[PDB]
Amino acid sequence: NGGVRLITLTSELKSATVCASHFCSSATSGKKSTEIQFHSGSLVGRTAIHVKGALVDGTEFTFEGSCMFPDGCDAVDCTFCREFLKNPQCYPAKKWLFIIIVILLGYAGLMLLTNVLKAWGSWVIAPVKLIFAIIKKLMRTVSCLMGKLM
Amino acid sequence: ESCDEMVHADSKLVSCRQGSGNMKECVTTGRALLPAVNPGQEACLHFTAPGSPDSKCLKIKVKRINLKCKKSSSYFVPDARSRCTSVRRCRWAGDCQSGCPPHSTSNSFSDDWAGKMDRAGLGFSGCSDGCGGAACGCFNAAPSCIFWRKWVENPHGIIWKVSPCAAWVPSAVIELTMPSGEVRTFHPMSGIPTQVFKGVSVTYLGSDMEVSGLTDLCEIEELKSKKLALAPCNQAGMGVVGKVGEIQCSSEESARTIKKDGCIWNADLVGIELRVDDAVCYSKITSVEAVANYSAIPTTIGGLRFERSHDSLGKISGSPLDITAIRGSFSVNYRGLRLSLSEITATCTGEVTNVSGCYSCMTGAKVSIKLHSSKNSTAHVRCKGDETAFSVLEGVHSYTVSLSFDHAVVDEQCQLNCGGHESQVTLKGNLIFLDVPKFVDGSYMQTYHSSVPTGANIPSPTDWLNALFGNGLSRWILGVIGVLLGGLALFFLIMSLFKLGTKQVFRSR
Amino acid sequence: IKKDGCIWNADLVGIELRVDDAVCYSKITSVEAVANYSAIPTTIGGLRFER
Amino acid sequence: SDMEVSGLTDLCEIEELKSKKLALAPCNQAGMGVVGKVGEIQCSSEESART
Ligand SMILES: *[C@@H]1O[C@H](CO)[C@@H](O)[C@H](O)[C@H]1NC(C)=O
Ligand SMILES: *[C@@H]1O[C@H](CO)[C@@H](O)[C@H](O)[C@H]1NC(C)=O
Ligand SMILES: *[C@@H]1O[C@H](CO)[C@@H](O)[C@H](O)[C@H]1NC(C)=O
Ligand SMILES: *[C@@H]1O[C@H](CO)[C@@H](O)[C@H](O)[C@H]1NC(C)=O
C-alpha cells in the first residue's frame, strides 16, 4: 500500500536505485527485505518498476516488474483535491451536506443583514461634524466682523 | 512509449538521386532544437521528404539528471612506507679526508647500494656523519664517511583514483536510438561535446545553479574495495605539503611501483634521523582518512544529498528536494547520416480502443491505438491540442501512446494518417485529476524533478457539481427544484429544533 | 583559418582528457551572446538608427 | 595528543660524558651558525673532539 519492496536472497543490499514512470527514488539500509516508497499517491495507474543497483562484492542486478496500482483513490480531507474532484467520491454522503450547510450559512447571513437593513448611523454622525464646521465658520465670521468694527 | 515536442526544422532539404535503383537517400544536414522534457519521456525527430509520404523518427530518452562535475585532471596516489639503509666504513685512504662530497657530488653510490632496482622507488641520495674510535669500528683519529639512502615502498598495493573538479555543472544521461536500428548511450555535459557519434551532436544545457558549500570538493574513489569519500583534494603537480597531494605517479600501472620516470614528488616527504651510525627514517605521509572535512558515501552537506549512483564514467550524484528548474532544452546538430525510405505505403486504417489517464498532469492521458498494414512503420498522427508520433510493426498489433488534453470529458474527433492514407478517429472516455504528490518521511529524491502543473488551482463549474444531481436534457431543472425543496424543508426543521432548544434553555432554569 | 593572416592571442580553445581521449570543448561565443546586442531597428535614446 | 608547552621554545639536551653532568640551556644549530652564544669550534666524531 505504501510502495514497492525489494527482496534480496544472495546477500545484503548495499545500494540500489528504483525508477518509475515520472519519479525516481533511492534508499538502502543493509537488510534483506527493504521497503522503498516514492510519495503519497504518486503511482496511480499502470506503470513499470525498473530497479537498478549493485550488491556487495561488486555484483550488479537488474529487474523489471509491473504492479497494479489503484486509480480511483484520492483520500483527501482538507486539500485542493476535495473541491475539484467529484467523479469517484470515495466518501459519498458529503456533497449534499456541504451544499446544505452553505445554503444555511447564506440564509443566516441574509437574515442577520436584514435586521440592520430594515432598522446611530452615518446619516446622523455626519451632520454632527457638518454643524461643527458651520459653527467654526460662524466664529471666524464673528471674529472678522469684530475686527472690521474695530 | 509516447512522444511529443515535434520540431520539423529542416523538412525537404535533400539533394539525392534515383537511389540505388528504386528508392534510397544520401545525406540530410540541418539544425534543430529540442525543449526540456520530464525524466522518462521521448522526444521524436520526424523528418519529411518531398518525394516520400512519410519517414522515420529519432527518439531521445532521458532517465536521470544528476549533479556531477567535470574532469580537470586524473592521477593515482599510492600508499608509501619508510624504508632506508646505511653502511659503516673507514677512511683508510684519501677518499674520506675531510668530507664526503667535495663540492657538488650527489652520486652517493659506490656500486654497492640497492638503488639500482625496479622496486626501489623514489629517494634522495643524502649523507651524514658518524662516530669514530675503537668502539665505532675505526683505528684512526679521523671522521668516517657514512652514507645513507632512503626510499618508499608499497607492500599492500592499495590504488586510489582522484579527479579534482571545481565546476559542478548539471548533466544527464541520454539513451539515443538511431533510425537505422542501433541503440547506444552516452553522458552529455552542460556545454561539453559528448563524443559525437555518426554526426549526432546532441548536447545538454543547464541554468548555472549556485552551490551552498561546494568550494573545494573532489571525487576520490577507491578501486579494490570500491569505497567513495568526499574530501578536498590537491591540484596539479605544483602542490604544497600538508594535505592531500603526496607522492603520485602517471598511470595506474605506475601506482603499484613507486619507481622514477613517471612519479612526481616535490620535496620534504620523508625524513632522516640518526644518532650513532643508525640512519633511521620516519614517516610523515598522512592517509586518506586524516585531513579535515572527510565525508563518506552518504553525504548530506547542505540541501544536497550526495548519493552513489551506479553509472559508468562517474559515481558521484545527488538530488535535493523539488527544484522545478527553469529550462533544460537540448541542442542537436547533424553532420552526416543515411536513412532508407520505402515510399511504397499502402492503404492503412486504425481506430481507438481505450482511453485513460490523468488530467493535464505529468504522466498525461494514455490512449491505446490499434493499426493494421503491411508496411513496417509508416505513421504520423496529427491533431489539435497535442501531437504524438510513434512506430508500429508489420501486421496487426496493439500500441499505447499518451497525449495531452485540457478537458475532463475528452469527446473530440482527431485525424489519423499512416503514410499516405488518412482517416478519422474519435475518443470517448472519463478522466480524473491528480495534483503534485506530497513528501513523505523515509523517501529521498534520486535524480531531480522537472515541473509540476499548478496553474489553474481553481474548481471548474463544468466538471464539479456533475454527478451530484444527474445527467439528461430536461431533468436538471426537476433535480434542482427537488434539492431546493429538500433544503428548505431541512432548514425549517433545523430552525424548529433551534427554537425548541432555546425555549428549553430559557425556562426551567 | 590557416596561418599567415589569421591572428589569435591565447586561450581560445580548451583541452580535456581522462583516458587517452584528449577531447576539446568549445568556448567561442556567437555574435548573439554579448550584452547590449541590438537589431536593425534601433531606438536607443533620441536617435532612431535605421538601415 | 600534541600537548603544548608553556616556556619551551629554545631548549636542548647538552650532556657531559666524563662527569655525567646534565644542564638545560639554549644551544646552536647546524654548521651555519652565529658567533656570540653556544656553537663554537666543533668537529664530526667523538674521537675528533679530543684533538
Ligand atoms: C572545512 O570546511 C570548513 C567550512 O567550509 C572550512 O572553514 C575549513 O577551512 C575546511 N577545512 C579545510 C582543511 O579545508
Ligand atoms: C482495452 O480495454 C481495457 C480497458 O482498460 C483494458 O484493460 C484492455 O487491456 C484493453 N484491451 C486490450 C486488447 O489490451
Ligand atoms: C521489417 O521488419 C522485419 C522484422 O523486424 C525485417 O525483417 C524487415 O527487413 C523490415 N522491413 C523494412 C522495410 O524495414
Ligand atoms: C551595456 O550598456 C550599459 C549602459 O550603457 C552599460 O552599463 C553596460 O556596461 C553595457 N554592457 C557591456 C557588456 O558593455
Residue numbers in the entry:
A (entry chain E): 358 to 476, 480 to 510
B (entry chain J): 561 to 1069
C (entry chain I): 818 to 868
D (entry chain K): 767 to 817
Paper text:
The ectodomains of Gn and Gc tightly pack together as a heterodimer, which further assembles into pentameric (penton) and hexameric (hexon) peplomers projecting from the viral envelope. In each virion, there are 12 pentons sitting at the icosahedral vertices, and 110 hexons covering the facets, giving a total of 720 Gn/Gc heterodimers in each virion. According to the topology within the icosahedron, the hexons can be divided into three types, peripentonal (P), edge (E), and center (C), which are quasi-equivalent in structure. Superposition of the 12 Gn/Gc heterodimers within an asymmetric unit (ASU) shows that the conformations of the ectodomains are quite consistent while the TM regions display noticeably different orientations. Structural clustering of the 12 quasi-equivalent Gn/Gc conformers revealed three clusters, with the 11 hexonal heterodimers clustering into two closely related groups, and the one in pentons being most distant from the others. The assembly of penton and hexon peplomers are mainly mediated by interactions in the ectodomains which form an ordered contacting network to stabilize the icosahedral glycoprotein shell. Inside the envelope, the TM helix of Gc also contributes to inter-peplomer interactions, which plays a much minor role. Across the entire glycoprotein lattice, there are four types of inter-peplomer interactions underpinning the assembly of SFTSV viral particle. Exemplified by the penton-hexon interface, the outer sheet of Gc domain III in the penton adheres to the end loops of the Ig-like domain C of hexon Gn, which is the most prevalent interactions between individual peplomers. Three sets of such interactions interlock three adjacent peplomers, creating a closed interaction network between a penton and two P hexons, or within three neighboring hexons. This interface involves both polar and non-polar residues, and the highly conserved glycans on residue N914 may also contribute to the interactions.
The severe fever with thrombocytopenia syndrome virus (SFTSV) is a tick-borne human-infecting bunyavirus, which utilizes two envelope glycoproteins, Gn and Gc, to enter host cells. The viral genome encodes a membrane protein precursor that undergoes proteolytic maturation to produce two glycoproteins Gn (the N-terminal half) and Gc (the C-terminal half) embedded in the viral envelope. It has been shown that Gn plays a major role in binding the host receptors, which induces the internalization of viral particles into the endosome. The acidification of endosome further triggers conformational changes of Gc to enable the fusion of endosomal membrane with the viral envelope, allowing the viral genome to enter the cytosol.
